Amino acid sequence: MNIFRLTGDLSHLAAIIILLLKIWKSRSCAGISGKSQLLFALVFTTRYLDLFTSFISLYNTSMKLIYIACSYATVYLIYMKFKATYDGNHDTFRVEFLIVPVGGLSFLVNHDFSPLEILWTFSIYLESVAILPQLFMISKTGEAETITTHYLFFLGLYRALYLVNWIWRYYFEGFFDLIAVVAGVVQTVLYCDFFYLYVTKVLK
Amino acid sequence: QVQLVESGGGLVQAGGSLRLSCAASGFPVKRWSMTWYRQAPGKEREWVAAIRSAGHWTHYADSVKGRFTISRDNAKNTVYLQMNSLKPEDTAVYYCNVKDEGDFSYWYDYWGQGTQVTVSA
Ligand SMILES: CCCCCCCC/C=C/CCCCCCCC(=O)OC[C@H](O)CO
């Protein structure tokens, strides 16, 4: 079938592009957690490290490049171009209690102890908790001027379609990745709290 | 990009055993999954057994649990399906399917030609 994972990825990319364009065209990153964007850039770097190694397709290599370039550009806009609007005093999450336990968890709990599997397991675990600095920022201030409704919609459609993908592959193909599913549920629950804080604190 | 060849099928008695093999050829990817399907005459295709490129994870359809065994052999680019205590309902054309588990690889999805398995009553 492979329709839910594709539309899920395209919805994920749309969210990334919307945020990058929002920061660029509004000339501000007010309300954005630079630490979460740094974690997302690290997710794509560790997952797509076999970019120039391992050529499979031109859609495959270019899409990996699009995600990396957009994630690095968003980090560039937050910490270099429009750093005057970066609320560092509110982006106070100590990401050491994320990277270090996620790193230890990837060495402990994985499907196979090999450098490529550990690296993939790291990026899976990290992506599930990468939004935490953003969550703690909005919970602290009640604000997210740069976070738009369409940005959150495509993030939510990305999580919903991945959920459909898990169910479809399990029932029709017998496939299930317990690590990816458990981490994906954690990520989806965290995104729902992300959506809950924005609707309750930022909107009204 | 990848060609798959299945062998090991044929005719066997009820209660007999057969081992299918899926030989992979072409250019590999680092993380993949391989699934056995079967399509009995007049029925829809259904998954039978599933395996990944590494780890101890396996999965078997309800109707073949306890009777079938899927296993790996990376030294040969081969995955086996051991089918023990075969019943006439297992008569079908069996297909192996390899999928790239990496991101953005929606069409790295390849199928064998199929092998006939018939179980006499
Ligand atoms: C602060 C740190 C936050 C970290 C947040 C991480 C969230 C995702 C966690 C997933 C746990 C894994 C659950 C599934 C475990 C399956 C293990 C398994 O099947 O292991 C096979 C093993 O290789 C046989 O030896």
Side-chain angles (χ1 to χ4, degrees), chain A residues 118-186:
Chain A
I118 301 308
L119 266 161
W120 172 86
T121 312
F122 179 88
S123 70
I124 287 293
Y125 290 161
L126 185 63
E127 190 194 352
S128 75
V129 296
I131 206 66
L132 278 184
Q134 185 63 74
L135 269 156
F136 281 52
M137 184 174 179
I138 305 184
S139 175
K140 180 182 183 300
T141 69
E143 304 177 278
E145 312 93 309
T146 315
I147 310 285
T148 65
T149 301
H150 291 83
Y151 170 74
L152 296 177
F153 169 77
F154 285 110
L155 277 185
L157 192 53
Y158 157 58
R159 301 314 300 161
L161 288 163
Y162 261 62
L163 170 63
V164 185
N165 169 76
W166 300 329
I167 305 180
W168 185 281
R169 297 199 66 183
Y170 181 80
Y171 185 85
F172 282 99
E173 310 170 9
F175 179 87
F176 75 95
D177 192 340
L178 190 62
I179 283 167
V181 168
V182 169
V185 168
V186 167

Side-chain angles (χ1 to χ4, degrees), chain A residues 97-98 101-102 105 109-111 125 128-129 178-179 182-183 186, chain B residues 56:
Chain A
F97 297 90
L98 290 202
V102 160
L105 186 64
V109 186
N110 49 81
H111 291 313
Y125 290 161
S128 75
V129 296
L178 190 62
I179 283 167
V182 169
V186 167
Chain B
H56 303 87

Side-chain angles (χ1 to χ4, degrees), chain A residues 4-18 67 150-162, chain B residues 106:
Chain A
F4 307 114
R5 185 177 182 177
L6 173 48
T7 61
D9 295 332
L10 294 174
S11 194
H12 187 197
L13 174 58
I16 295 180
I17 293 186
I18 283 165
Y67 277 65
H150 291 83
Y151 170 74
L152 296 177
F153 169 77
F154 285 110
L155 277 185
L157 192 53
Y158 157 58
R159 301 314 300 161
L161 288 163
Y162 261 62
Chain B
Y106 319 103

